[PDB]
């Protein structure tokens, strides 16, 4: 517990940019794109106000659009007089991917017609399209093969406080070890992480901070409408914060909370508000109506585990169940607790042979051990129960491919 | 029940079945079969023939049957086993786990074939496990896969009985003969004996 991420003060004008959304759409061969940016203001509307959105490639401006506020008519009462959407044509854009994280810079200016700037906001933009077609998850029209890992925000001395040096260390080791994707298990991360994934190039699954694993049954809260409001904010406020990061390619509704009607409502909310990214969620059998991707945890390659209600089928078999057509990417697989990873090659062979097996996220990146000191003051790695905590789950907190200090296992 | 249409020796295999001038002759092989056998309950599936590539004549005939008798699925393996002229993915000799990615007409592992992008049909091999001589090695691997995967709905072993013919030696005693034993040439020798049983019905 505590105040474990940054605290800051931000001084905005009273007439201000209060939100902005960047979308990129493409023609059939990605040789042309339209960047569309919706900008919203708070404050007093005045006829002399304008917004300009400019797109930069390095120090060169490649496109720009300027307009006064006042959106298109949307219903019988008119439109949003406090919004405007700029559309910029971009020829032959440099596309973003984990392989080549090409980025442009969008600067959003709130200014007057005669040239005075009131304030500006801005973001890195990656031109990429994410879509599922014909059963395959495609990035810029090509099917991905996710070499992913789940990563908790953990440091053996600082707990859950994250710092730039550690995040950079983790990304460098991930890329150096042939990973191209990361799942934010199981909550939105410190803001800097997305900027690093945008720039260094990693596909990100951003996941809402909702996990109710200990309920009996697991969906007791998530199927209860009285918990819909609290859940809703955990999903909506994550999309509101992170929707402009190109590295985020998939939204997740949380983790291990069964499957409840609140999930279906929230899945639909995201699909309406942000059609640019698939939504996944594994609860309740990994292939429910609240997921665009079959995303099981620890389903085996060839071996079925036919648990009642929530069976974990062999991933090869799952794909072909009657009526099924979605891609399958494991949200967690290969549990790297202690001396483990036996059988790892079996997954890879299957992922390469089956088009619709598009990979998975290993569980997990780094052991959650904590440092304690002996009487000598010499440090040692501690796990559950070592702080007098009870009940506890002993060494189940250490499932990483790397030790807490980042030394590889 | 399968129409008497096989043009395996053509190059390419669909040279006649994609030629409209052969549509009339092919049509009668299919229509006259359905007219004769459509009241038998034992027939559950019609087949358009065997090993004649995939030609437009097949698509015309597939549709004719679908119109006249909607009570039974239509299958046909030519041209890749999964063309628009078949309601069932019906490969011959596709392996359980091993792909054989021949150009144009790959033979995928059956488990993999079911889940190719956009595929949703059942898969029942029209021919599998070639029982020529001392064979059937690997039979169990098919059965384990059929029972584990709902959409792998089995198959037809190749084949029931050896096509050996009896000849008599100088002493009048009978012996089993195969290709080339009658002076026939060219011939394909013992490839005519692929059955689970000998020609006299004794089991292998
Ligand atoms: O690293 C721990 C791992 O636990 C997973 O759950 C393990 C196991 O917990 C038992 O209490 C249940 O009987 C059983 O159904 C469950 O599989 C969890 O799925 C992972 O996310 C991870 O925490
Ligand atoms: O019992 C023989 C068996 O042969 C199969 O064809 C074998 C092989 O022979 C080559 O001449 C062909 O060009 C090649 O494509 C073919 O696979 C035939 O598929 C079976 O029906 C059966 O006659
Ligand atoms: Mg300017
Ligand atoms: Mg305990
Ligand atoms: Mg010969
Ligand atoms: Na694959
Ligand atoms: Na754990
Ligand atoms: Na089956
Ligand atoms: Na033969």
UniProtKB/Swiss-Prot annotation, chain A:
Induction: By allolactose. GO terms for biological process: lactose catabolic process. Na(+) binds at residues 396, 399. The keyword Mitochondrion does not apply. Changing residue 256 to H: Slowly inactivates galactosidase activity by reducing the binding of magnesium. It increases binding specificity. The active site is at residues 256, 332. Mg(2+) 2 binds at residue 392. One of its GO terms (molecular function) is beta-galactosidase activity. The record marks 152, 186 as: Transition state stabilizer. Mg(2+) 1 binds at residues 211, 213, 256. Keywords: Glycosidase, Hydrolase, Magnesium, Manganese, Metal-binding, Sodium. Substrate binds at residues 256, 332-335, 399. Homotetramer. This is Beta-galactosidase. The chain holds residues 207 to 615 of 1024 of the full protein.
